[PDB]
Design an enzyme around this catalytic site. Structure first.
Site, short mmCIF file in Angstrom:
data_model
loop_
_atom_site.label_atom_id
_atom_site.label_comp_id
_atom_site.label_asym_id
_atom_site.label_seq_id
_atom_site.Cartn_x
_atom_site.Cartn_y
_atom_site.Cartn_z
N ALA A 138 0.84 -1.21 0.00
CA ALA A 138 0.00 0.00 0.00
C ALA A 138 0.87 1.26 0.00
O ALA A 138 1.93 1.25 0.64
CB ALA A 138 -0.89 0.01 1.23
N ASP A 139 0.47 2.33 -0.70
CA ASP A 139 1.08 3.65 -0.44
C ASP A 139 0.11 4.53 0.37
O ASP A 139 -0.99 4.08 0.71
CB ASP A 139 1.57 4.34 -1.72
CG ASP A 139 0.44 4.74 -2.67
OD1 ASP A 139 -0.70 4.98 -2.23
OD2 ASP A 139 0.70 4.83 -3.88
N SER A 140 0.49 5.76 0.69
CA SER A 140 -0.33 6.60 1.56
C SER A 140 -1.76 6.86 1.12
O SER A 140 -2.63 6.93 1.98
CB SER A 140 0.33 7.92 1.81
OG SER A 140 1.43 7.71 2.66
N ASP A 177 -3.54 4.74 -0.69
CA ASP A 177 -4.22 3.48 -0.41
C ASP A 177 -4.63 3.37 1.05
O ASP A 177 -5.77 2.94 1.33
CB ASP A 177 -3.36 2.27 -0.73
CG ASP A 177 -2.88 2.28 -2.15
OD1 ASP A 177 -3.68 2.60 -3.08
OD2 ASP A 177 -1.68 1.96 -2.32
#
Ligand SMILES: [Pt+2]
Ligand SMILES: [Pt+2]
Ligand SMILES: [Pt+2]
Ligand SMILES: [Pt+2]
Lengths: 76, 76
Positions: free
Chosen positions: A35-37, A39
């Protein structure tokens, strides 16, 4: 409850595209589950709505791992 | 997995006589769920057998909480 963790896990699988086997309590959304931020904000929004609860800014920031998310749900 | 936590929770309820609602990840067997040291050894023995795994002395001593037990299972 098992129903709570099934519901949390379903959402993570839906959003992050990982195997269920990879959704362990100690797994961090960013470092382990890709996940990134953007997400992560999206996940929290989605979990909030699934469990009919509002999470504050301060508490959501403490949610690095699958277990952190289940802990918050379980304390509400 | 939800099946793992259902299985862990069933055993804790069986042995400690607590409500399912009280079996949260952060709940410690001794301080929250009323287990004493003999009970805890018994729980671990029972969890070992349910999941066909052997836990070492060193690792079992780190198991204060429901979440600690699920974490160990999930890492094997
Ligand atoms: Pt629950
Ligand atoms: Pt945890
Ligand atoms: Pt699992
Ligand atoms: Pt935990």
């Amino acid at each position: 409850m098992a129903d709570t963790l099934e519901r949390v896990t379903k959402i993570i699988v839906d959003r992050l595209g990982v195997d269920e086997a990879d959704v362990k309590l100690e797994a961090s959304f960013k470092e382990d589950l890709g996940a990134d931020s953007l997400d992560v904000v999206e996940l929290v929004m989605e979990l909030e709505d699934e469990f009919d609860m509002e999470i504050s800014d301060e508490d959501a920031e403490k949610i690095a791992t699958v277990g952190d998310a289940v802990n918050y749900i379980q304390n509400q």
